[PDB]
Amino acid sequence: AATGELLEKSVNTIRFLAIDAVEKANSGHPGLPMGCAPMGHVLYDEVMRYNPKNPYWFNRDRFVLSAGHGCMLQYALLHLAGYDSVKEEDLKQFRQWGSRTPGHPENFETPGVEVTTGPLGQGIANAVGLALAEKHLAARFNKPDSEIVDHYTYVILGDGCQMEGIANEACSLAGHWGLGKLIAFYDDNHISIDGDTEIAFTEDVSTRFEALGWHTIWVKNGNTGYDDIRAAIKEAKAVTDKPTLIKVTTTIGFGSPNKANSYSVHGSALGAKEVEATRQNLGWPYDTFFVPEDVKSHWSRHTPEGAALEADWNAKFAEYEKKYADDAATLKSIITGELPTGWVDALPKYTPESPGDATRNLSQQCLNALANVVPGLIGGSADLASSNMTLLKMFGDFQKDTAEERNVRFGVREHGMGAICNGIALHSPGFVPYCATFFVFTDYMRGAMRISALSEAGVIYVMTHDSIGLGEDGPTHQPIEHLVSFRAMPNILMLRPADGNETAGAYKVAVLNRKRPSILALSRQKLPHLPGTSIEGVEKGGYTISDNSTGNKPDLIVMGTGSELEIAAKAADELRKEGKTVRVVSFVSWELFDEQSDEYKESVLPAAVTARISIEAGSTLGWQKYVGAQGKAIGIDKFGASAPAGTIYKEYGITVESIIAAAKSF
Amino acid sequence: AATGELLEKSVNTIRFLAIDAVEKANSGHPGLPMGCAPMGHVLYDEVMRYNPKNPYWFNRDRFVLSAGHGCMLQYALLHLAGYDSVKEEDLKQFRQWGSRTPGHPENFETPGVEVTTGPLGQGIANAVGLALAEKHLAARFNKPDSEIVDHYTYVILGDGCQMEGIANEACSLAGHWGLGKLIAFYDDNHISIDGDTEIAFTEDVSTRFEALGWHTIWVKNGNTGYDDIRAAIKEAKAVTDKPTLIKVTTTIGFGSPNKANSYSVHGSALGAKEVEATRQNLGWPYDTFFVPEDVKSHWSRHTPEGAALEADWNAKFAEYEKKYADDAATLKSIITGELPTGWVDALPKYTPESPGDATRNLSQQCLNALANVVPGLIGGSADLASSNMTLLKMFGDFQKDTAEERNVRFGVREHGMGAICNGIALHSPGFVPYCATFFVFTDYMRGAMRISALSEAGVIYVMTHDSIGLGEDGPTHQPIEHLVSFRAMPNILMLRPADGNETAGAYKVAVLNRKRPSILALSRQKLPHLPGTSIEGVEKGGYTISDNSTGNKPDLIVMGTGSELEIAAKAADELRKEGKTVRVVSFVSWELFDEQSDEYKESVLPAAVTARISIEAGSTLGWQKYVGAQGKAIGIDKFGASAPAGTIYKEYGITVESIIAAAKSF
Ligand SMILES: Cc1ncc(C[n+]2csc(CCOP(=O)(O)OP(=O)(O)O)c2C)c(N)n1
Ligand SMILES: Cc1ncc(C[n+]2csc(CCOP(=O)(O)OP(=O)(O)O)c2C)c(N)n1
Ligand SMILES: [Mg+2]
Ligand SMILES: [Mg+2]
């Protein structure tokens, strides 16, 4: 470990890389990096196990910056540690077009960044997920003679993250689950954007954490108390049954004579005068982006030492694989992301002779089938297991003493649940996390869902009670705008399966899509199995299920999704008996349809056919793209009602009579 | 107060109204009402001041059921208390089409219900807002000799609300603000839908509440400890400096011999055999929906006593008006919802001599102008005051010791902030609450925003940094799907003003809309004032700002919103110089445009004109409604980038050259 002047110079190297990167961009956040440089130095230089030349090493300790605005702290540390993703020139292209150093940390841009933060509270909730993943894999795979899984999860969070509901949700679960390898550093700097925290944040954070089942430590001088930081981390490792909150009191902008300890230093460049004053105050004669030779030499040891650490773990994995071949192959699937051969064949098959069932129940059949062939399938419901139908019946519950189990019981914590699942997904590429609530409550967890899409986290969102079909719970519970609100969102599938074959298809797509989250909108109510539904169809997003036309010139195209596809099918039957040629199209995914060839699109929605009807129990917005200038979208552009679902469908005109009336009107 | 057998019969009347209403609907939640009947009886029969024949009486105590699924508790109590909104026939139409007894409590269906709950956590956050409103009005208007504002806010919440992030956010603020008249009853029944709370919820809730700055009491026998409940409420009311959490341990489904104390009784009808077993166990001979004549006689006193309470307060208000005329007129305005005459004339006006500015700054000008003329304007930012530009410069901050002030500092608590503002809006109809964050973080607070729309709460959502225009903070911060995600949501305006006149117009609409929330998407970056923008235009949602066409047959229509309207205007200038006729249309609100006459719509978007272009820095989804299949929507259907905003606009093709290219292609 560095001592005396070398330690001071190393900590200031981190401060000035942040200051100088922010100054060059004339954009970003120097305050947090200046105050957090001491704990950042101790974490990357002394405590964390990693190989800086292999950011993908399975058994690395994981670091998350929940206060993502402070990203120049992490970029400085990744640079000094020898990560290939943060060269000197990447620091010089902070916040610049297409750089590896974006203004908030992005796993998809910067190998060595574990998750995407910037939206406050996501990172601490992600760290709960990363620690769940480690605890599960250790319980599931470790043997008396092979501790093949053993790593810590370290997270830096500030006052903003500590005010966000998502952080209280995830930290309640971390305490409940006894995640003893989760070690959180609270940057206790008494500053947020509005200024002193006294303006809006006077709670006793440490006592709240004790109440949540956490171990708490207070480091009163985080600016210069290196030994206190080191002793806090050692005490944290000694407490194996509870997550640890190390409250570290720092000065934001430590070393700035004129901007330290003020909102001034949170979120803008120091400027020329204050950069010079800070250099003079800290005693930093060095040029911009300068790493002193002695600091360079000190940090250089992480490359050989990190290679040696990973080699030690590789030898342990080889011995594990020799003695426990089956368990090693199962773990290797979670590590590599290579899904076992033939996994798709586990999915259930249906015909129109299969009895009708709700897609929430058909979803449970798919989850249970997949659990046997997808080793990384893990997850569950926010307190709605018996309504969302999420239980893997061959497994018990994930708990402190049963972490090997694969049902995760999130309680009434949708937002925390989503960010925990992002952490599981981004732990190892063979994780397939799923989580569930009523579809309407995606609104509670939408911040985490958007970050699934941005961070390429393949979370499966199992969202039941997808419409007015749920009935009596009424308009507070009935989605309307939700489908289109996700159709608009980049990099997320909005799947709305009609029946058994479409639900199996939606799950095949969701499991294959390890870099894009999938939402499945699933019915409360029972639906028939329809002639012509197929997995192959779902993979194309929009596909024909019935057609009595010739020349690719149906008199009418009726398109539907989910529970409304049977209404389209029944209307088509009645219209065909009157001598009309009708094509019925399933739009189970707009996103996958849009990805298809021009020739495929023409085969389903011929340009010459203008007589087009859509039916879906939700917003009509965006359906005009598929029903066109002459067509009619049947839907709901108002809130729902508290009544038996049958009554709502009739009153809202979500009926075969509405389709027949629209067909007459062309 | 009821004693002995009369008390038992009154409490059981509440239990059996709930049981029998749920049984008739074969739908709903008997568990919470059966467990909570004792505390509900004490609250409505003994503690709360109200007039059952005037649900609007300003100085009534407020009750909120945060655990809204338990709504038959409140419907039973409103019925027994003599509210005109809940007669015997209304109880018989529980969860039936269009009834006054929907499956969750809805202020917009049922006078006597203060707010809309059902989405867990909203109600407790609403109660923080109702108590803020009382504390603000008391500090602002009370005099040493006239305590004219004096009422309590009572809220019942369960394990679900206590797990939700929004509840921790709002309760942190309640403790910070010293809301001593906020009294919360935690239904501590150790059950949620997944069963015993031990599955996912083992935190020490009461100690967390102490850490949040709350006074705590524990009633260990909530089933039969009537004196313990009464003493807890007396102690709570006597603690003036802190909100009180009364943890009330109950049995869910108390009195059901076979379903008490289980998830079974949470959320479905008892069924015939268990209804009879419950009648036998509790000793209830009475027919369905029957209120014993002794219970009827006891409760009848609330009609004359409630009229007398309101009459006493009216005499107090008349004496206040006599002695403090100007303060009485201002408070009366907030009570009645009459906005002062001429308030619209306070809004700023802009001409070709006005300097260009960001709509975030123009928004601050409108807020400051309105603060002088709209007595109920109150609110602020989630820790972004100096970036959202929300400070009312003539006022200080709302705090425990300065509750008269009108700047509310929410900290990093978007979801809590939204639900607090729903509480303020629904306290008194002259309140005009506003709140703010970056537009992208609407996702954090979307559950409360949707309830603004459903509950007809006129909250003004001031949402700055509306696009890639914000630049370097990057894709975590840059809205894409957000505008269309709110266009699809019923009963909410999605306003996107281009300049000074449009920002003034958006604020006029937002203030007038006391029954529909308004979102204003506001720019980080400076924009010009565009000739042809007007308040009158904003009121119509979609309107022409420039036109050199004749016969309502422009060669080209270019439409834009916000920061992209100047791009449309510049493109139109270039095209008109070539001899083309071009109409430029502002779509500041889709919603208001859609409300206009067929004749008005035809006057702006003539059916004969197919050459139509839209430009907006966000999703293109839904623009085909206005541009048509033959038109072109210029936008962004991918995530943003971390770069100077100018670079992003160029790379993403949000340019006059894109409009010119689209115009060439027709
Ligand atoms: C969900 C969310 N809301 C708001 C913001 C805007 N924001 C950026 S950092 C910050 C607060 C800064 O406080 P703290 O977390 O204490 O950081 P410090 O200034 O101490 O470094 C806010 C409000 C955000 N990034 N995410
Ligand atoms: C935000 C949100 N998520 C999920 C639900 C679905 N839900 C309804 S009640 C409930 C929990 C019930 O537990 P509790 O609040 O403890 O009520 P109790 O069963 O004791 O009456 C859940 C998860 C909801 N209504 N709101
Ligand atoms: Mg801080
Ligand atoms: Mg409960």
Numbering used by the authors:
A (entry chain BBB), B (entry chain AAA): 10 to 675
What does the study report here?
Because of its unique chemical structure and its promising weed control profile, cornexistin (6) has been the topic of several research programs over the years. This has included the MoA elucidation of cornexistin (6), i. e., its capacity at inhibiting transketolase (TK; EC.2.2.1.1) [11f] which is an important enzyme in both the Calvin‐Benson‐Bassham cycle and the oxidative pentose phosphate pathway in chloroplasts.
The importance of the C2‐hydroxyl group close to the alkyl moiety was then explored. Lastly, closer investigation of the C3‐propyl side chain revealed that it provides significant stabilization via the hydrophobic effect, since the side chain is buried in a hydrophobic pocket of the protein‐protein interface. We confirmed Zea mays TK inhibition in the double‐digit μM‐range (IC50=50±5 μM). In contrast, the C2‐hydroxyl group is prominently involved in a hydrogen bonding network to Asp482 from the first monomer and two adjacent water molecules that in turn are near the reactive ylide of the TPP cofactor.
